[PDB]
Design an enzyme around this catalytic site. Structure first.
Site, PDB file in Angstrom:
ATOM      1  N   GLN A   1    -114.653  15.314  41.149  1.00 58.71           N
ATOM      2  CA  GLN A   1    -114.926  14.015  41.763  1.00 58.71           C
ATOM      3  C   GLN A   1    -113.720  13.083  41.665  1.00 58.71           C
ATOM      4  O   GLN A   1    -112.744  13.393  40.985  1.00 58.71           O
ATOM      5  CB  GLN A   1    -116.143  13.376  41.086  1.00 58.71           C
ATOM      6  N   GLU A   2    -113.795  11.943  42.343  1.00 61.24           N
ATOM      7  CA  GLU A   2    -112.714  10.958  42.353  1.00 61.24           C
ATOM      8  C   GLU A   2    -111.322  11.597  42.341  1.00 61.24           C
ATOM      9  O   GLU A   2    -110.474  11.226  41.544  1.00 61.24           O
ATOM     10  CB  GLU A   2    -112.846   9.993  41.162  1.00 61.24           C
ATOM     11  N   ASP A   3    -111.108  12.574  43.216  1.00 58.80           N
ATOM     12  CA  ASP A   3    -109.822  13.263  43.359  1.00 58.80           C
ATOM     13  C   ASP A   3    -109.368  14.355  42.392  1.00 58.80           C
ATOM     14  O   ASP A   3    -108.201  14.742  42.394  1.00 58.80           O
ATOM     15  CB  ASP A   3    -108.709  12.242  43.503  1.00 58.80           C
ATOM     16  N   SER A   4    -110.265  14.864  41.570  1.00 60.05           N
ATOM     17  CA  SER A   4    -109.875  15.944  40.695  1.00 60.05           C
ATOM     18  C   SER A   4    -110.287  17.227  41.435  1.00 60.05           C
ATOM     19  O   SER A   4    -111.181  17.184  42.282  1.00 60.05           O
ATOM     20  CB  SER A   4    -110.592  15.812  39.351  1.00 60.05           C
TER      21      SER A   4
ATOM     22  N   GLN B   1    -102.880  13.263  50.252  1.00 58.86           N
ATOM     23  CA  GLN B   1    -103.950  13.212  49.263  1.00 58.86           C
ATOM     24  C   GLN B   1    -103.730  14.090  48.037  1.00 58.86           C
ATOM     25  O   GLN B   1    -104.097  15.275  48.026  1.00 58.86           O
ATOM     26  CB  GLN B   1    -105.305  13.574  49.864  1.00 58.86           C
TER      27      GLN B   1
END
Ligand code: MG
Ligand code: ZN
Ligand code: ZN
Ligand code: ZN
EC number: 2.7.7.6
Lengths: 36, 159, 146, 84, 773, 188, 65, 114, 133, 263
Positions: free
Chosen positions: C114-117, F17
């Site tokens: 989550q949150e970019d991991s 990203q």
């Protein structure tokens, strides 16, 4: 001058070398000192 | 503009009304103009409201303004906070800015962040002009190895 | 009559044309020329990815072994990308690639990404996925006017 | 400048900062092998213990509340109501 | 001075963060290596030698170990280089600087620190790899993500310091912040997305899974709920077990646009006794909202229980989501064939209007608006046509999105996504702009050398008719580039100028605190607020409630609160009250009722003089509405038999209560008024809620339930008063300055520029304006 | 040295990203395709909408194709390559045209209720890894504690903590002071 | 840098096929897609392994010492 | 650097036992077994088997954190039927079953040509 | 140890608003035009359609943890096919000579309209809904 | 002839397609996981380097060597170093190979896994032997040498399991599937107009009967029959992975029964 970069500033820098493209991109770079 | 207003039956009624919005200011001379309700007239220049209606008015204005800035983002923040801001910014009878006015002070002492590394010339001068430091600041009390009179240290414990 | 699935373009209402672009993709620089479909991408995202390419690893010279410089990151197994650009060819990208064609899956799995991991396949890290060499080098001399 | 046990206008309750500094101090003493005034139900942690001594109004400490004028009020931990 | 700037940082650590669904809201994962490094000086004691001695034996490089041992005489025994490491008979009084262990309180923070929430205290949990780990819900107070952010761990060093952390700034004690005056943390990402899916009516769970879910909740009482379906196959509803996660005695009511105690759409939210009764659980119910499940549970069950609530939820919901999966691909960005058609024309006719309006202007038939140029009002109209085209093309696209469309799903749950996204991805991107205008003529009389001069069409000046899925054209790609750039330039500015403001605000109020006389002053002792927030209340104990009394017709006001014992028709029907029959006509009682009703009217007038809006919903301490529902099912009151309540019990009970609220205690004339003031608005609400009819005809309370409620309100009210010591100077500053560091954008100065204008008391403002009535 | 992918390491695709690793799972735990293919990376669907990063999705779909057919996917900007046409090619290869694929949960073996966007994408490996930033100072007898964290601590009202941090452990000394002239002129 | 030994994703040994592969291309003039399939590389994970490889060890060798 | 040794996934450390049986408190005739150095393979498999026994009232397992190769298994049985025995049965069954499978597969394999 | 409601209904409508397994049944009772029913059913485990004459029963019987088999040869309140369990929440004066009832079965809703029920319908949690044929 | 039964569709030196019926999804699943990660195999796990003038680094080469598959049929009788009483390794818990290669010609010298030379006593058991399934017989390309570059190494291979490192993986990639028609309803297909037309069909469909238009959902049906296919890297015979895999999982559950005993 070429070692430091202070003609008489920021000019002249250690050539980037992490990636082949990052190097190309460094030789193709520009800089603007200091209305839009 | 819309305007919830009371009805003679009691319920609030949306009783629309005409309002002029201006792009320039001259509060002093527009209140006088007949045909307008001089009571409801408003400006977003609190500095002009203050000069014409008095600091208490200015305070309300300044708040009304700070509010909109936040509100315009959908955000909300409890009154007590902006209120407090608006008050500090007011207690002296006039509108005081906070985005650093003085180059020395706002509400500190002659020891906190002894900046200038001139705690040298500052101490010499502090001795000259019998200075009385209140020691209510965190870092001043640090130098004394004490807790400042804030939260946890705003009272003494005894036997 | 017109393939709907294709972008809508204006017309050639012109009988005064003096020149013609060699190709429009030639308005991008080195960095941007490595982005696949930058035209189906939000404006800024392309500027972030342009900056990050510089933070990337891979072969930067086929003579890294003979060079002596403060830090150098070489990718164990560089890989030319499956999706490319008619411009990558002049930036000798398929020759000195940075990056590796990883088999990705977009999904909510253990809650660990989550949150970019990201969740990464351990078993493949083992078989060599994304390993790199790190070469640091110190240096010194003797005295001065003494 | 002192204020009689009567006339005290300050809060009857214990503020969190007060209840936080008491547990602190007390806990400290306990950590320093100090006499304990409670019957451990088998508790080992000092803070844990101080919370219990506070719970059993058994802490001989007094909080001296200073007003900004300079005067003050003295309240014994024991009195202060402990809700929170 | 090198110490005041915290330069010399001892007992701290810093690394990369990474989320963890199995850590509790209040924990923080510490990599074993870091734990072996950070220490805590623990004095020896009859109650820890066993443990302490084992740690010393374990040594400096085996986790539950220690470094240095300090004896009576201040000596420092180094357990790594010391002929007597395998010995050491620890002694009462000595200190063993242990390793950091599980449950130790530590300060954790992410920079920049513009909150309190950006520096909270967690219980340690030593873990294997090398990144600090934290619960996802702790994500926003810190404002952290996992693309590589770093965070700092600080270790308290005294027994006093420790308590100060655990008792004042612990993560659960911060769940409901005093700034937004609501819950600071909610349920997010995967957990938010899954809690919605898991909650649809369509969603069923069979035994095999029901049991694994039930077990995943630690506080579970091993009692399998009876299946919602027992027929051919015993099946459970997604809501059924998610309710296991919710503690008992938690009541919540919602009612969205079309909700109706039958929610045909499964709208709204209805939880009773910690059992969900109807409604899909999404952001509104479990996000960080004002009336939310979280805000409530915290105020009702306590902060520690609310802390675990995040945990229990994320365990069931995240486990469920694991075995169902969720995903997103391009398919999700594709619109139906007919839909693209209806969109391709929606734009085509949009261009027409633009074309016509141009021909009209080229003929000089355009009549400029007031104060505007023929040129300005042309642009104005053209821009409006295009944004309008972009929006209707979007809603068109948004509409076909099935309930399957993963993107729509993330939008419905409230976890990423928004019209603007679907609109720009699936349908038209939009009009590009820069400096609040369409692409200017940087070239002479034109946009790019691929156009002819004096060309004001949409193609020319910045319109992007295509979607990201379709791809931009070269000309489109460049303008967009020009815009997106402006978005980067000021984002850089908005970042700086705000960080400035924020620090500058803290400087002005950093010395203001609340004193024991319930006043708010600065370091000079000067009065800034005679009562904090004017009401002596603490923002976190405030909630938005509606003062019924203001609204409605004078008629409904009377049918509701009016009681006239001297009058057959308008009196208390004896079904409501025990002494209802023998009260018909009590002269001495009417006096009381009349004095009550009078007071209610005085109030209605007062509220309408304060809030001219007619606006009834305002934050005030003590959520009365709840306390009542907390009486309906706590004493099992049946609205069938009359109440054993005396018309005096009520009238005189409610009247005495008010004597106790108390925010000030001064025994003199002035202060006693202040007290009356600070409490005026709240009493209005009190009187309006505990009015005789209401307490009898609206919520049949009994002499005990009512006697209980009264008792309760007094308590809650007193917990809501601000504690002398609160550093509201900082609170305030940080409370205005943090929500200001999120602003990033009908013609007026707004946003940081405006705020800076205000805070700088600038006499040369950019958008003056007078508003005459 | 030879640096091997660790939990806190940084990676990114070419669509602006980035994103560190938050754990690693072994092929048996990873979700799997019916053919037996298992992912190398698993990013979160929640990182797509707000980004408007559609090229990423296309690149992937296009890549599944190139691999499946041994061709090189042309992802140049201004071409006539479409999501539709690419989906046509993918479908000829027997896979559902948009990239979705039925997958199974590694723990249970049961099917995943949702199908998942599965395929190859080009991912880069960013430098500056965790084992280079772990620093943890302790010397008993960012990371600085500046005015900013000091303020937060004052808000919390942690008075004694601020004393313990900003101070320099120099062992408190005991002096006798005169109550009339605050100088240390007391013979004790 | 040399053909990976074994494909990352599943481990099908893919180190014994570089040369075979480069041959099915040159002399047998096959398209990469057909060559791969004949080397038995059926899943795309395994395919991308060979297809995408860049044999740098070849220019690495060209430096004298 | 802060990574444990891979062999810690299957090899028991010091003082660790494959099984730990603590009596459940919440419900009666319930138990919580802790399997060390075992993942879902054994976990999800036994909960399956255990769920065929009509005298098993409750049965589930969880691995509280993927960093630690271990898991808990809770088992409730009807009164008079020791949960331990419930586990013993499931295990036997799981074996007899794999007994047949290993047999049948080899058989089938011996008839194959190639 | 009781039965609280019995009656046969003629379903007039069956609505599937984006629910692949649940539908909203709005049937009108037989006999009393007063009595009317609204219910959510799992058309996957128990189908339903146009003018079906479904039988309906409420009661509260055949809360301690749930058990499954064995009783398979003991208790059989299975004289019906579809069966749910749920909690009741409120009675509303639908004004006049008819009083309604809202039932929630873990999400599947139900509304009942009549009057004699004031005596036949519980005032608490327990409540099973049985349907047959 | 009891519970879990097999039906083999194809067989070979590397693949085995079969159908498992009368088995819970669980067992079918575990059995699969076991194969992928819990079956002993021999793999180079130690590399000593004498000379490396190659253009590759030592750990790079070493990583590949550990990756080269090696015979492992008689591993069930080779021991885990950590259990052998020797000091380090021996012919009882290892197999030592040696790789010596020198750039002789000026045509680029290739080093293959067939240049590995077992130097320890294999004690007559089939184990340790670079596996080779190549057409020209060069089981995996280890490295390339130029003019006169050297490479002297000694490798020690140890009994291992994937869990420790993927190299001890003898299973390559398993094909898993059940309920080819979504009869069971363990999936909700994502469509764009017609699910049934958008999602291709599995060859397993052919081996099962369609759903029939108007039949109500069979709520009592569970997952029976799984269509698998086990690939094999070679280190072990295909048919072996399945067996040993079943063995291992079988022994595991056994250990829990012993554990309750000692208890
Ligand atoms: Mg970040
Ligand atoms: Zn003196
Ligand atoms: Zn592969
Ligand atoms: Zn040995």
């Amino acid at each position: 001058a070429l070692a430091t970069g202070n003609w008489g500033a920021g000019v002249s820098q250690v050539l980037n070398r992490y990636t082949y493209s990052s190097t190309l991109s460094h030789l193709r770079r520009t800089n603007t000192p200091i209305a839009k | 503009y819309d305007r919830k207003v009371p009805s003679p039956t009691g319920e609030y009624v949306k009783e629309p009304e005409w309002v002029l919005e201006t792009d320039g200011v001259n509060l002093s001379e527009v209140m006088t103009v007949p045909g307008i309700d001089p009571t409801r007239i408003y400006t977003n220049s609190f500095i002009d409201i203050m000069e014409v209606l008095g600091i208490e008015a200015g305070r309300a204005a300044l708040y009304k303004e700070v509010y909109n800035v936040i509100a315009s983002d959908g955000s909300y923040v409890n009154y007590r906070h902006m209120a407090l801001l608006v008050d500090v910014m007011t207690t002296q009878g006039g509108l005081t800015s906070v985005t650093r006015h003085g180059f020395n002070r706002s509400n500190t002492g002659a020891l906190m962040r002894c900046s200038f590394e001139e705690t040298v010339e500052i101490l010499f001068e502090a001795g000259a002009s019998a200075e009385l430091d209140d020691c209510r600041g965190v870092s001043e009390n640090v130098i004394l190895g004490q807790m400042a009179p804030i939260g946890t240290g705003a009272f003494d414990v005894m036997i | 009559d017109v393939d709907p699935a294709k972008r809508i373009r204006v017309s050639h209402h012109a009988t005064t044309f003096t020149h013609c672009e060699i190709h429009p993709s030639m308005i991008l620089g080195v960095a941007a020329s490595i982005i696949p479909f930058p035209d189906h991408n939000q404006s800024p995202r392309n500027t972030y990815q342009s900056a990050m390419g510089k933070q990337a690893m891979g072969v930067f010279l086929t003579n890294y072994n003979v060079r002596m410089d403060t830090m150098a990151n070489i990718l164990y197994y560089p890989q030319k990308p499956l999706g490319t650009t008619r411009a990558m060819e002049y930036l000798k990208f398929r020759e000195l690639p940075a990056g590796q064609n990883a088999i990705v899956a977009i999904a909510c799995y253990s809650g660990y990404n989550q949150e970019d991991s990201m969740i990464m396949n351990q078993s493949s890290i083992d078989r060599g996925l994304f390993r790199s060499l790190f070469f640091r080098s110190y240096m010194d001399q003797e005295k001065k006017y003494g | 400048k002192a204020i009689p046990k009567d006339q005290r206008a300050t809060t009857p309750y214990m503020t969190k900062y007060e209840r936080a500094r008491i547990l602190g101090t007390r806990a400290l003493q306990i950590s320093m092998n100090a006499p304990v005034f409670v019957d451990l139900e088998g508790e080992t942690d000092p803070l844990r213990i101080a919370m219990k001594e506070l719970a059993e109004k058994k802490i001989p400490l007094v909080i001296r509340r200073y007003l900004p004028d300079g005067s003050f009020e003295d309240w014994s931990v024991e009195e202060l109501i402990v809700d929170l | 001075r090198g110490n005041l700037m915290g330069k010399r940082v001892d007992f701290s650590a810093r690394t990369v963060i990474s989320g963890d669904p199995n850590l509790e809201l209040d924990q923080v994962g510490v990599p074993k290596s870091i734990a072996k490094t950070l220490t805590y000086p623990e004095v020896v004691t009859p109650y820890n030698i066993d443990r302490l001695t084992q740690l010393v034996r374990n040594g400096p490089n085996e986790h539950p170990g220690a470094k240095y041992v300090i004896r009576d005489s201040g000596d420092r025994i180094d357990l790594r280089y010391s002929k007597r490491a395998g010995d050491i008979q620890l002694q009462y009084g000595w200190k063993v600087e242990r390793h950091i262990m599980d449950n130790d309180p530590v300060l954790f923070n992410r920079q920049p620190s513009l909150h309190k929430m950006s520096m909270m205290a967690h219980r340690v949990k030593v873990i294997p790899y090398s990144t600090f780990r934290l619960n996802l819900s702790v994500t926003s107070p810190y404002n952290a993500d996992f693309d590589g952010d770093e965070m700092n761990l600080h270790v308290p060093q005294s027994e006093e310091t420790r308590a100060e952390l655990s008792q004042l700034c612990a993560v659960p004690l911060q769940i409901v912040s005093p700034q937004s005056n609501k819950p600071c943390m909610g349920i997010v990402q995967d957990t938010l997305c899954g809690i919605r899916k898991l909650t649809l009516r369509d969603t069923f769970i069979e035994l095999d899974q029901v049991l694994n879910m039930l077990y995943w909740v630690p506080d579970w009482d091993g009692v399998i709920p009876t299946p919602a379906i027992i027929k051919p196959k015993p099946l459970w509803s997604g809501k059924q077990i998610l309710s296991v996660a919710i503690p008992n005695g938690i009541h919540l009511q919602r009612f969205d646009e079309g909700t109706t105690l039958l929610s045909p759409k499964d709208n709204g939210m209805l939880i009773i006794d910690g059992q969900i009764i109807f409604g899909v659980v999404e952001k509104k119910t479990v996000g960080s909202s004002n009336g939310g499940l979280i805000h409530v549970v915290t105020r009702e069950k306590g902060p520690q229980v609310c802390a675990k609530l995040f945990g229990n939820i994320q365990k069931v919901v995240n486990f469920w989501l694991l075995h169902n999966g969720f995903s997103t691909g391009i398919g999700d960005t594709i619109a139906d064939g007919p839909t693209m058609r209806e969109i391709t024309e929606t734009i085509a006719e949009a261009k027409k209007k633009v074309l016509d309006v141009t021909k009209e202007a080229q003929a000089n038939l355009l009549t400029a608006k007031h104060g505007m140029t023929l040129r300005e009002s042309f642009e104005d109209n053209v821009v409006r046509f295009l944004n309008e085209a972009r929006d209707k093309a979007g809603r068109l696209a948004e509409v076909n999105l099935k309930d399957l469309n993963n993107v729509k799903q993330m939008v419905m749950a409230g976890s990423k996504g928004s019209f603007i996204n679907i609109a720009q991805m699936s349908a038209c991107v939009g009009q590009q702009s820069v400096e609040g205008k369409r692409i200017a003529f940087g070239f002479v009389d034109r946009t790019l050398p691929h156009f002819s001069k004096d060309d004001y069409s949409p193609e020319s000046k910045g319109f992007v008719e295509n979607s990201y899925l379709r791809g931009l054209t070269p000309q489109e790609f460049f303008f967009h580039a020009m815009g997106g750039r402006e978005g980067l330039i000021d984002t850089a500015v908005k970042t700086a100028e705000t960080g400035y403001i924020q620090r500058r605000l803290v400087k002005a109020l950093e010395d203001i605190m609340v004193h024991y006389d319930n006043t708010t002053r600065n370091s000079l002792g000067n009065v800034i607020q005679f009562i904090y927030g004017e009401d002596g209340m603490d923002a976190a104990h405030i909630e938005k409630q509606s003062l019924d009394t203001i609204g409605g017709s004078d008629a409904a006001f009377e049918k509701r609160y009016r009681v006239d014992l001297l009058n057959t028709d308008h009196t208390l029907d004896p079904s409501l009250l025990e002494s209802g029959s023998e009260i018909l006509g009590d002269l001495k009682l009417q006096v009381l009722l009349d004095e009550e009703y009078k007071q209610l009217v005085k109030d209605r007038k007062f509220l309408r003089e304060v809030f001219v809006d007619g606006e009834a919903n305002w934050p005030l301490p003590v959520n009365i509405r709840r306390i009542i529902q907390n009486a309906q099912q706590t004493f099992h009151i049946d609205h069938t038999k009359p109440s054993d309540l005396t018309i005096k019990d009520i009238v005189l009970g409610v009247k005495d209560l008010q004597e106790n609220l108390l925010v000030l205690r001064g025994k003199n004339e002035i202060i006693q008024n202040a007290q009356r003031d600070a409490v005026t608005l709240f009493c209005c609400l009190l009187r309006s809620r505990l009015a005789t009819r209401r307490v009898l005809q609206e919520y049949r309370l009994t002499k005990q339930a009512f006697d209980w409620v009264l008792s309760n309100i007094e308590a809650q009210f007193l917990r809501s008063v601000v504690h002398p010591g609160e550093m509201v100077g900082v609170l305030a500053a940080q409370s205005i300055g943090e929500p200001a560091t999120q602003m990033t954008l009908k013609k007026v100065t707004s946003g940081v520029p405006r705020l800076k204008e205000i805070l700088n008391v600038a006499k040369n403002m950019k958008t003056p304006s007078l508003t005459v009535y | 040295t030879t640096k091997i992918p660790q939990i806190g390491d940084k990676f990114a695709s070419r669509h602006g990203q980035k994103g560190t690793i938050g754990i690693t799972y072994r092929r048996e735990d990873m979700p799997f395709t019916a053919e037996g293919i298992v992912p190398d990376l698993i990013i979160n669907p929640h990182a797509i909408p707000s980004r408007m990063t559609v090229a990423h999705l296309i690149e992937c779909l296009l890549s599944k194709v190139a691999a499946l057919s041994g061709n090189e996917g042309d992802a140049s900007p201004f071409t006539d390559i479409t999501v539709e046409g690419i989906s046509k090619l993918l479908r000829e290869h027997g896979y559902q045209s948009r990239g979705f694929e039925v997958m199974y949960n590694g723990h249970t073996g049961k099917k995943l209720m949702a199908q998942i966007f599965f395929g190859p994408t080009y991912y880069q490996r960013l430098r500056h890894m965790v084992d280079d930033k772990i620093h943890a100072r302790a010397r008993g007898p960012g990371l600085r504690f500046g005015e900013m964290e000091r303020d937060c601590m004052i808000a919390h009202g942690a008075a004694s903590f601020l004393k313990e941090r900003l101070m320099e452990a120099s062992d408190a000394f005991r002096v006798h002071i005169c109550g009339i002239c605050g100088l240390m002129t007391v013979i004790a | 840098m040399i053909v990976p030994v074994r494909c990352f994703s599943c481990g099908k040994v893919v180190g014994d096929k570089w040369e075979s592969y480069l041959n099915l291309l040159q002399e047998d003039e096959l398209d990469e897609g057909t060559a791969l399939s004949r080397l038995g590389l059926k899943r795309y994970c395994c395919r991308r392994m060979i297809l995408t490889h860049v044999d740098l060890i070849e220019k690495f060798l060209r430096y004298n010492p | 650097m802060n990574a444990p040794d891979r062999f810690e996934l299957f090899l028991l450390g010091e003082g660790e036992s494959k099984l730990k049986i603590d009596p459940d408190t919440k419900a009666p005739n319930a138990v919580v077994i802790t399997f060390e150095k075992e993942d879902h393979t054994l976990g999800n498999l036994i909960r399956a088997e255990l769920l065929n026994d009509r005298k098993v009232l409750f049965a589930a397992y969880k691995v509280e954190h993927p960093f630690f190769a271990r898991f808990k298994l809770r088992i409730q049985t009807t009164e008079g039927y020791d949960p331990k025995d419930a586990l013993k049965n499931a295990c036997n069954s799981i074996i007899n079953k794999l007994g047949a499978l290993k047999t049948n597969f080899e058989t089938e394999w011996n008839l194959q040509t190639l | 140890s009781n039965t609280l409601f019995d009656d046969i209904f003629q379903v007039s409508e069956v609505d599937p608003g984006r629910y692949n397994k649940v539908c909203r049944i709005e049937a009108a009772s037989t006999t009393q035009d007063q009595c009317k029913l609204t219910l959510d059913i799992n058309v996957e485990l128990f189908p339903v359609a146009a003018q079906d004459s479904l039988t309906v029963t409420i009661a509260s019987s055949l809360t301690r943890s749930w058990r499954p088999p064995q009783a398979g040869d003991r208790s059989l309140a299975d004289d019906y096919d579809y069966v749910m369990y749920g909690t009741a929440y409120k009675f509303e004066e639908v004004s006049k000579d008819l009083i309604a009832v809202y039932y929630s079965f873990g999400g599947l809703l139900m509304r009942l309209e009549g009057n004699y029920r004031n005596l036949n319908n519980l005032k608490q949690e327990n409540a099973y809904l049985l349907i047959r044929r | 002839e009891e519970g879990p039964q097999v039906k083999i569709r194809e067989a070979s030196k590397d693949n085995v397609d079969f159908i498992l019926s009368n088995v819970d999804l669980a067992m079918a699943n575990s059995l699969r996981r076991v194969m992928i990660a819990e079956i002993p195999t021999l793999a180079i796990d130690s590399v000593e380097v004498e000379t490396n003038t190659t253009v590759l680094a030592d750990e790079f080469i070493a990583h590949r060597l550990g990756l080269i598959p090696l015979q492992s049929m008689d591993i069930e009788q080779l021991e885990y170093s950590r259990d052998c009483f020797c000091e380090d390794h021996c012919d009882k818990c290892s197999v030592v190979l040696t790789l010596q290669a020198f750039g002789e010609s000026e045509s680029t010298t290739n080093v293959y896994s067939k240049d590995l030379v077992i130097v320890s006593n294999l004690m007559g058991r089939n184990i340790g032997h670079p596996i080779i399934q190549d057409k020209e017989g060069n089981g995996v390309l280890i490295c390339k040498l130029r003019k006169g570059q050297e490479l002297k190494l000694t490798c020690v291979a140890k009994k291992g399991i994937a869990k420790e490192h993927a190299k001890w993986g003898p299973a390559a990639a398993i094909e898993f599937e059940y309920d080819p028609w979504n009869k069971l309803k363990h999936t909700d297909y994502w469509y764009e107009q017609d699910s049934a037309k958008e999602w291709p069909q599995s060859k397993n469909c052919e081996y099962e009967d369609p759903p029939n238009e108007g039949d109500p959902f069979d709520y009592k049906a569970q997952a029976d029959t799984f269509y698998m296919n086990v690939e094999s890297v070679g280190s072990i015979p295909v048919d072996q992975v399945v067996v040993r895999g079943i063995d291992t999982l079988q022994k595991k559950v056994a250990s829990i029964l012993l554990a309750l005993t000692q208890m």
